[PDB]
Write a protein that holds these residues in place. Structure first.
Motif, PDB file in Angstrom:
ATOM      1  N   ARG C  17       0.776  -1.218   0.000  1.00  9.24           N
ATOM      2  CA  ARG C  17       0.000   0.000   0.000  1.00  9.24           C
ATOM      3  C   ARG C  17       0.821   1.289   0.000  1.00  9.24           C
ATOM      4  N   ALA C  18       2.110   1.143   0.237  1.00 11.50           N
ATOM      5  CA  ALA C  18       3.022   2.307   0.240  1.00 11.50           C
ATOM      6  C   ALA C  18       3.116   2.758  -1.223  1.00 11.50           C
ATOM      7  N   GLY C  20       1.605   0.556  -4.010  1.00 13.97           N
ATOM      8  CA  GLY C  20       0.470   0.105  -4.803  1.00 13.97           C
ATOM      9  C   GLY C  20      -0.897   0.473  -4.306  1.00 13.97           C
ATOM     10  N   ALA C  21      -1.825   0.349  -5.241  1.00 10.10           N
ATOM     11  CA  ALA C  21      -3.250   0.628  -5.075  1.00 10.10           C
ATOM     12  C   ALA C  21      -3.858  -0.461  -4.200  1.00 10.10           C
ATOM     13  N   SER C  35     -17.452  -4.362   1.735  1.00 11.58           N
ATOM     14  CA  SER C  35     -18.337  -3.195   1.738  1.00 11.58           C
ATOM     15  C   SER C  35     -18.742  -2.824   3.174  1.00 11.58           C
ATOM     16  N   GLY C  36     -19.067  -3.867   3.930  1.00 17.82           N
ATOM     17  CA  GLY C  36     -19.479  -3.728   5.327  1.00 17.82           C
ATOM     18  C   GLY C  36     -18.340  -3.082   6.115  1.00 17.82           C
ATOM     19  N   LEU C  37     -18.470  -3.114   7.420  1.00 11.76           N
ATOM     20  CA  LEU C  37     -17.500  -2.562   8.369  1.00 11.76           C
ATOM     21  C   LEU C  37     -16.761  -3.697   9.097  1.00 11.76           C
ATOM     22  N   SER C  38     -17.313  -4.882   9.053  1.00  8.06           N
ATOM     23  CA  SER C  38     -16.828  -6.123   9.624  1.00  8.06           C
ATOM     24  C   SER C  38     -16.168  -6.985   8.538  1.00  8.06           C
ATOM     25  N   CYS C  39     -15.120  -7.644   8.938  1.00  9.61           N
ATOM     26  CA  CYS C  39     -14.291  -8.539   8.144  1.00  9.61           C
ATOM     27  C   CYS C  39     -14.770  -9.983   8.287  1.00  9.61           C
ATOM     28  N   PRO C  40     -14.955 -10.638   7.151  1.00  5.55           N
ATOM     29  CA  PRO C  40     -15.393 -12.041   7.095  1.00  5.55           C
ATOM     30  C   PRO C  40     -14.603 -12.927   8.040  1.00  5.55           C
TER      31      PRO C  40
END
Lengths: 45, 45, 45, 45
Positions: C17-18, C20-21, C35-40
């Motif tokens: 992320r430094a 790359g996208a 999309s949500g706020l919680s991670c699977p």
């Protein structure tokens, strides 16, 4: 950034934004939405 | 993130952004806009 | 929100992320962007 | 801004957002997403 013609244009704009979108309000109150961070000389308010 | 070639490129860029958009200014001051969070080695400023 | 398979997937991701996208890094480190706020449950890290 | 029909619509909505997107949740909980900053009279919660 929302730039307006007059203070009246500001009120009208800040009060439209409760219910309306950016562009609807921009057009209705006679305000402009710029890309920069500074507001044009013609739309100071 | 805005990355520039020189300090002159930075000034020019920070000062263009008052009035202009991101891409117009990027191109005009010879700055780049990356996706990452880090600025390339060639555009440190 | 960036969700990863492992801690290794996290490092790889935070460090990509430094330069790359979001999507390039997501794919490369084996992380997902929800999309949500919680991670699977399968991508906790 | 997320505006809901009832408090039940709010819970359902705040809890869906963990896992789901804005529009999926909006539709599922019977909530609306406005442009303005103020929530309609029909979707106060």
């Amino acid at each position: 950034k929302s730039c307006c013609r007059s203070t009246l244009g500001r009120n009208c704009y800040n009060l439209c934004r409760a219910r309306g979108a950016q562009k609807l309000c921009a057009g209705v109150c006679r305000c402009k939405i710029s890309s920069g961070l500074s507001c044009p000389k013609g739309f100071p308010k």
